[PDB]
Structure formats: C-alpha cells, structure tokens
Short mmCIF file of C-alpha atoms in Angstrom, two decimals:
data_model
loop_
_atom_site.label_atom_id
_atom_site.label_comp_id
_atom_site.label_asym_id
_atom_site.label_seq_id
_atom_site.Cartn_x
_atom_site.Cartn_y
_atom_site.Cartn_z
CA UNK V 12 127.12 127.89 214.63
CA UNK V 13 125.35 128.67 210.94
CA UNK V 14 121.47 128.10 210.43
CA UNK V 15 122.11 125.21 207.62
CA UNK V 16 119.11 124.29 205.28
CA UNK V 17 119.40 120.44 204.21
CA UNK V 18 118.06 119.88 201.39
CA UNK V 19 117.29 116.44 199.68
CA UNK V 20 116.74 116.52 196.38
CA UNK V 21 115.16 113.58 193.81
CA UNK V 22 113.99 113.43 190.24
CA UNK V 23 113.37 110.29 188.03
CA UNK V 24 115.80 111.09 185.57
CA UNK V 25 118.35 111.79 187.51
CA UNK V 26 120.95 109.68 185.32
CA UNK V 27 121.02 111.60 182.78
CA UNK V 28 123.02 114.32 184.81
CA UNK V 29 120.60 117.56 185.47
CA UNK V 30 121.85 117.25 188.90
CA UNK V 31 125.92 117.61 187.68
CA UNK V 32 126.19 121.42 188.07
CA UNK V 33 124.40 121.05 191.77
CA UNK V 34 127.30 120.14 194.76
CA UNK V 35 125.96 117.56 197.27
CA UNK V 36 127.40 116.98 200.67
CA UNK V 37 128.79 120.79 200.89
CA UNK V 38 127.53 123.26 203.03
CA UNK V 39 128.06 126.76 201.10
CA UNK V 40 127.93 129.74 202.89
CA UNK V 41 125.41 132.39 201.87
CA UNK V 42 124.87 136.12 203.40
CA UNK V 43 121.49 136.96 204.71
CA UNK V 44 121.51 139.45 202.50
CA UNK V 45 121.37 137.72 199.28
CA UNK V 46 118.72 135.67 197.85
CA UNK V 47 119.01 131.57 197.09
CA UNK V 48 117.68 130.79 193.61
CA UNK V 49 116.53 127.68 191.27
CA UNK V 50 116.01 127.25 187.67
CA UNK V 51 117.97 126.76 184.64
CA UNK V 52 119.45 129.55 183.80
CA UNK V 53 123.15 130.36 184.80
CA UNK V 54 123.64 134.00 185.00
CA UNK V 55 120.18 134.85 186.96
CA UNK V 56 119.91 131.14 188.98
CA UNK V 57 122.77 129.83 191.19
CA UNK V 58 121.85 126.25 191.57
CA UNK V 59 120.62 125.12 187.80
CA UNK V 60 118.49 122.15 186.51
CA UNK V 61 119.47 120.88 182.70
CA UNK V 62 115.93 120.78 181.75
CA UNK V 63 113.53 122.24 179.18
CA UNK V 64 110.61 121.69 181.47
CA UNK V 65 111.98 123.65 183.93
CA UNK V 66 111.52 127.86 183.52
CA UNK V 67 114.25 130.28 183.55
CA UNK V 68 113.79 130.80 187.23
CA UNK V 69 111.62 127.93 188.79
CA UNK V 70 111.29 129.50 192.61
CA UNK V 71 113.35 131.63 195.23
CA UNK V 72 114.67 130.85 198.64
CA UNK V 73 115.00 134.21 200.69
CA UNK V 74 116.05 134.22 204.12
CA UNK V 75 114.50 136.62 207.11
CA UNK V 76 113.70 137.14 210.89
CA UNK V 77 110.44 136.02 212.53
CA UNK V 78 109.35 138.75 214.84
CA UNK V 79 110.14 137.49 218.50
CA UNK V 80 112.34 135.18 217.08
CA UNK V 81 116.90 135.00 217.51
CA UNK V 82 116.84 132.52 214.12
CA UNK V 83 116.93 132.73 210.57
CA UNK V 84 113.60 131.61 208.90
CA UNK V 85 112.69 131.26 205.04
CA UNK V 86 110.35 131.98 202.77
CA UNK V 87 109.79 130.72 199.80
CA UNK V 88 107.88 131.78 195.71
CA UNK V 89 107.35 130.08 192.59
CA UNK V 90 108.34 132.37 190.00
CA UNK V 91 107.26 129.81 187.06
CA UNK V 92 104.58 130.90 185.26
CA UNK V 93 103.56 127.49 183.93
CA UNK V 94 104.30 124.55 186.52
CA UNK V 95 102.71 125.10 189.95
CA UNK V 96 105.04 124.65 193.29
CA UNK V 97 103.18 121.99 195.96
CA UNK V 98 104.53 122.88 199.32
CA UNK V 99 103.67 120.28 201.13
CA UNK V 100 99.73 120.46 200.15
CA UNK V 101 99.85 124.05 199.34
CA UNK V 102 99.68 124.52 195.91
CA UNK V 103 101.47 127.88 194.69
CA UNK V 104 100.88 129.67 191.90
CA UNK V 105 102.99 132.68 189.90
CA UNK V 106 104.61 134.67 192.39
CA UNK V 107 102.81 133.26 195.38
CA UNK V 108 104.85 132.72 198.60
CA UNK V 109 104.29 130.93 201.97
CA UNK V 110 106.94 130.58 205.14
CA UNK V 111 108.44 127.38 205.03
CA UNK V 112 108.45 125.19 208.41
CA UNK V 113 111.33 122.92 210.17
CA UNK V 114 110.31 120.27 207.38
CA UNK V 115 108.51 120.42 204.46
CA UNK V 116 108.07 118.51 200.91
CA UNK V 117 108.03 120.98 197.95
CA UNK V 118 107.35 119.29 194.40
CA UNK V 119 107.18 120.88 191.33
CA UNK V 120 106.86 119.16 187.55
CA UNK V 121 108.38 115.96 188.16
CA UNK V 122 110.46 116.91 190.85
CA UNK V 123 110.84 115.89 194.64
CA UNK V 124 112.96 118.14 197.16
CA UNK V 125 112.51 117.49 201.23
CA UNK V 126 114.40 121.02 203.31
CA UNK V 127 115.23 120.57 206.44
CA UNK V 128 116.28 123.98 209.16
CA UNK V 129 118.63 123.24 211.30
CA UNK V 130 119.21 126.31 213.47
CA UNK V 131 122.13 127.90 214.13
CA UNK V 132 123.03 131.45 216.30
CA UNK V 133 124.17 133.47 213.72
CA UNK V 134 121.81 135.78 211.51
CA UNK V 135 124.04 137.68 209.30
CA UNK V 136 124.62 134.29 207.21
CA UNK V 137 123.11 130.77 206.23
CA UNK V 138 124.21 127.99 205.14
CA UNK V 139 123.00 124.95 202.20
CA UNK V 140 123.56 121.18 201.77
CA UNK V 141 122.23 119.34 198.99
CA UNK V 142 122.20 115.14 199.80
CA UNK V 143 121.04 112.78 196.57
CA UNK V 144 118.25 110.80 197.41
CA UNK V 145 118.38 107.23 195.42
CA UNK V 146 114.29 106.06 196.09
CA UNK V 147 111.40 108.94 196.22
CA UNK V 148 110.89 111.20 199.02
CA UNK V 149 107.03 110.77 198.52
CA UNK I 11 97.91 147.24 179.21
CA UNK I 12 98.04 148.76 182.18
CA UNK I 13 100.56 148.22 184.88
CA UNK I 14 100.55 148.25 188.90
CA UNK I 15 102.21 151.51 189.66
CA UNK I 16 103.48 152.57 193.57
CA UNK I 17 103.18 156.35 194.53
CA UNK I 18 105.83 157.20 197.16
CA UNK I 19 105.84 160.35 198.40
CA UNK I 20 108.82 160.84 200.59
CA UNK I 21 110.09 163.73 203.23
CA UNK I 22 113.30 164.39 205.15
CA UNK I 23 113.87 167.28 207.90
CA UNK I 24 117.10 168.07 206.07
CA UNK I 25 116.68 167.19 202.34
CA UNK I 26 117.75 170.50 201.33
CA UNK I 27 121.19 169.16 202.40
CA UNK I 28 120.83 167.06 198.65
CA UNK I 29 119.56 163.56 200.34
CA UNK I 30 117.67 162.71 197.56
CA UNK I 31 119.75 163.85 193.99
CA UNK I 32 120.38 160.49 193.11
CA UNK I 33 116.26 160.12 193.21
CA UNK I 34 114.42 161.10 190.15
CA UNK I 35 111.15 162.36 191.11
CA UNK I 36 107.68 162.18 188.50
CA UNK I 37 109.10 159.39 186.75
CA UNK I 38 107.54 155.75 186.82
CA UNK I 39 110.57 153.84 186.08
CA UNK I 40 109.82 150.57 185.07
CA UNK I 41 110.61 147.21 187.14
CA UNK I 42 109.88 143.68 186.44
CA UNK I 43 108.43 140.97 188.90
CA UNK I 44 111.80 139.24 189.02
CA UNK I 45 113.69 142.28 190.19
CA UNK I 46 113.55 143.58 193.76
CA UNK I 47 113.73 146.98 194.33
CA UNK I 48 116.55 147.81 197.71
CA UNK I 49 116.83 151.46 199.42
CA UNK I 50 120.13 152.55 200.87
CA UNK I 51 123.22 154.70 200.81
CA UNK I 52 125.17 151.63 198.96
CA UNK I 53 125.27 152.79 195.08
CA UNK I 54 125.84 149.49 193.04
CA UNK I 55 123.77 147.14 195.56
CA UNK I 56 120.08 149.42 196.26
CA UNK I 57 118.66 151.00 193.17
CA UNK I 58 117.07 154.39 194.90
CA UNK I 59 120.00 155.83 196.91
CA UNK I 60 120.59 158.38 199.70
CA UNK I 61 123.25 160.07 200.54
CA UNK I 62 123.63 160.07 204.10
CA UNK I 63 125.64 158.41 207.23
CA UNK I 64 123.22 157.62 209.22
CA UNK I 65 121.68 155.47 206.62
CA UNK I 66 122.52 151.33 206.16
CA UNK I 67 124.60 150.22 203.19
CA UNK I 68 120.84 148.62 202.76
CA UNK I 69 117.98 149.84 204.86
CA UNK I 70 115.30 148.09 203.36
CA UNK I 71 113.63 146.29 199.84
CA UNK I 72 110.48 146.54 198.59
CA UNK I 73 109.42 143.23 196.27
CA UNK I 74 106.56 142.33 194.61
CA UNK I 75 104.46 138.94 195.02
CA UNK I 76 100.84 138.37 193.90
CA UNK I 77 98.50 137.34 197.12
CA UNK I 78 96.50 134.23 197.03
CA UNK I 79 92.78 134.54 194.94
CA UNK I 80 94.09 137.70 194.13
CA UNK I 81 95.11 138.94 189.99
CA UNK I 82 97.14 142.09 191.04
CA UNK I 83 100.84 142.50 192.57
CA UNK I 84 101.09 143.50 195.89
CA UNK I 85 104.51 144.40 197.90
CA UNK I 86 106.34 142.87 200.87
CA UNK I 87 108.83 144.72 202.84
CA UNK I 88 111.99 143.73 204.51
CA UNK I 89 113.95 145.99 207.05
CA UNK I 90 117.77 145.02 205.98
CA UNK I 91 119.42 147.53 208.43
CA UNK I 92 120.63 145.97 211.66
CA UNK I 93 121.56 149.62 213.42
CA UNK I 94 117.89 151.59 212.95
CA UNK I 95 114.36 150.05 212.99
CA UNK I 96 111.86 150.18 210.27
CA UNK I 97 108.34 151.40 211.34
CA UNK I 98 105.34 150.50 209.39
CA UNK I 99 102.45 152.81 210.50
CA UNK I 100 102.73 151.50 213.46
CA UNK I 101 104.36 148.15 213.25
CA UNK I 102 108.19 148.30 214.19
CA UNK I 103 110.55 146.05 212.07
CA UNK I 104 113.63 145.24 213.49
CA UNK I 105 116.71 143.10 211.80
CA UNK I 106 115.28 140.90 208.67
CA UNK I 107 111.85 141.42 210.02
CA UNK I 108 108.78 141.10 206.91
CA UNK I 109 105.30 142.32 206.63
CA UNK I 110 103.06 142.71 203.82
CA UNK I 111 102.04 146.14 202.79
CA UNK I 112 98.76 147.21 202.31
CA UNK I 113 97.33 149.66 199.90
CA UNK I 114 98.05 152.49 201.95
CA UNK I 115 100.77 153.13 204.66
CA UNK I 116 103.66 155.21 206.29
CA UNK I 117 106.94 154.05 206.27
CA UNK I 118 109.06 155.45 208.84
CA UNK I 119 113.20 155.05 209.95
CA UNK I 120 115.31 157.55 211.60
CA UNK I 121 114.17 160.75 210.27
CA UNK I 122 112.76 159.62 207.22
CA UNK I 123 108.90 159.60 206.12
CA UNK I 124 107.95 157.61 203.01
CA UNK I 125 104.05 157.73 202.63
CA UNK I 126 103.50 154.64 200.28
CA UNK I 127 100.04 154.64 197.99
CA UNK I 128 99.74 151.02 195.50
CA UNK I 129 97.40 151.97 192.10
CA UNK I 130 96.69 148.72 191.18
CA UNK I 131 97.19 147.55 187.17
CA UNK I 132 96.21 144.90 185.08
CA UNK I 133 99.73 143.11 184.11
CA UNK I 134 101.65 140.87 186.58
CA UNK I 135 104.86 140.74 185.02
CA UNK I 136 106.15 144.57 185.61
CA UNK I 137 105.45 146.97 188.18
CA UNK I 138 106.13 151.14 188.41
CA UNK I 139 107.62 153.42 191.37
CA UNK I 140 106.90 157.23 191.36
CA UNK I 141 109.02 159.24 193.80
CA UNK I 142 107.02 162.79 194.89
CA UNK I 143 108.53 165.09 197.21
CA UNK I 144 106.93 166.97 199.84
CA UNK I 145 107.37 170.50 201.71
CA UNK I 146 105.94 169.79 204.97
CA UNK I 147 106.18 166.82 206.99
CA UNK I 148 103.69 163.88 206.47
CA UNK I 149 103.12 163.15 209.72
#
C-alpha cells in the first residue's frame, strides 16, 4: 500500500475554472525522490492555479523520513514572496517551512486547502488526490 | 549586495583516483533559492558529481530555507541514498532522514569527509557553494 496525501481543495471563485488544469478524484503516483509543487506556472509547477494573485511558485510539498519512523512524512515552504502561507495558525513567511501533521488547514490569499496522510508501507513513492470541496473548509 | 556563500571543503582517501573532476574547486557558482542543490554519481539529476560505485545515483541535497525571526538563508539536508548512511557530526541519517545544518559541521558517508562552513550574506534570493580540497584528512 502507497502513503496517499488527500487533499481538499476550495476557493471562492472556483467557477471561473482555475481549478480545470488540477485532476480530482485521481491518485497520481509520485517518487520520493521528486518534489510536489504549486503555483501558476507550467514548466516549474506541476499542479497550476489560473490566477494573477497567485506567484510563480506559491509553496512546495517535499516528502521525507521521520527518524524512528517506517512512513513517509512531509514538509512543507511558502516560496511566495508576497502572500503569507497560514498552516493551520502558523503563519509562514518567504521560504519558511514547518512539518505538516495527519491533518492540517493551510490557507493562503483567498484560498482554502485541508491534507490529509493516510499511511501506507512503501517509502520509495507517494501518492496525491485532489477532492472539490462545494462550501468552505473554514 | 552581498550574498550567503557555503565553504565546503571536501576529502577522499582515494581522490587521486579523479573522484572529484567533474567538481570545480575556488569557484562560487551561483544558485538561486528555488533551486536545490543534489550530490551523487547520477550526471543529469545531482549538480556536483562523483565518479564512483560505491556512491548513490543521489546521496544527498543540500536546500536552502530562511529560519523563523531570522533575515539570512540557512540549509537543510536530506540523506537520499537508501544503501549508505549520512553522518552529520555526529547525527546519523538514514533513508529520507532531515536535519537542519548549523553554521559549522562535518558531513560524513562512506569514505567521504565534507567539512561544511555557511558565511552568511545579505540577499535571500541566491545563495553560493565553494568547493576546497584538502591534503590530509579532516578528521
């Protein structure tokens, strides 16, 4: 079994279709070598936002090993210089990171996204799901 | 103006062998805050390679993040090889194991000695590495 991290995403203009080039309901399959990243740009970013708002690169998912530990864990930074990323109420600035828990709220501009760790037994890969959220998370 | 340069001053029993010819020593190559600097004997995927068996396709990255209250890059390392450990001073890193560097410490895996030294800088966006070799061991 594959560590998945669920991740429920929201935003209030959602219509409009920033969310079009993200793939819901899909677990993709990432080695632990490589590093998950957000933003708007294509070639640096893998899952992109249509938005001005958002920077180039908004923040970076990178997975690793918790010492003691037989599970993939991750840890997160904000690489936008302007907006600040709130995980949960930890407010983090450019280039600051923090080791996200089992559950945890990040928010950043005007967005809302809840992740979620569901273990797994391998460590050489992960695994992501995105699920639309209709109402707010918070 | 200024930027946040790492000295690395590195040692191998049997670098006359031609470990390190892919490594350009004196030379503070230029890196910015988005990029992550990876060591291993893989030549597309790590940017500072060695030539060597016993070496992972990636034995470990160096990347910088800036520490909370704090207006100066610091580094983070990550042991990527599964086979050998990673030993900071005396910390040992095994598979996908992190730990923040401090200003000053001795990187150690297999045979290898890296002796890493941060001069800190004034911009955030960029960062240097300078590679110095040594005659006799570090440690």
């Amino acid at each position: 079994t594959v560590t998945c991290l669920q991740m429920t995403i929201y935003h209030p203009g959602q219509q409009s279709g920033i969310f079009k080039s993200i793939r819901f309901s899909s677990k993709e399959k990432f080695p632990s070598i490589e590093v998950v990243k957000f933003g708007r740009n294509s070639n640096m970013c893998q899952y992109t936002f249509q938005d001005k708002q958002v920077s180039r690169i908004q923040f970076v998912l990178q997975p690793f090993k918790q010492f003691n530990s037989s599970v993939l864990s991750f840890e997160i930074k904000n690489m936008s210089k302007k907006t600040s990323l709130m995980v949960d109420n930890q407010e983090l600035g450019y280039l600051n990171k923090m080791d996200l828990p089992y559950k945890c709220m990040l928010r950043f501009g005007e967005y809302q996204f809840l992740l979620q760790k569901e273990d797994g037994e391998s460590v050489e890969s992960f695994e992501t799901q995105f699920i639309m959220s209709s109402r707010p998370l918070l």
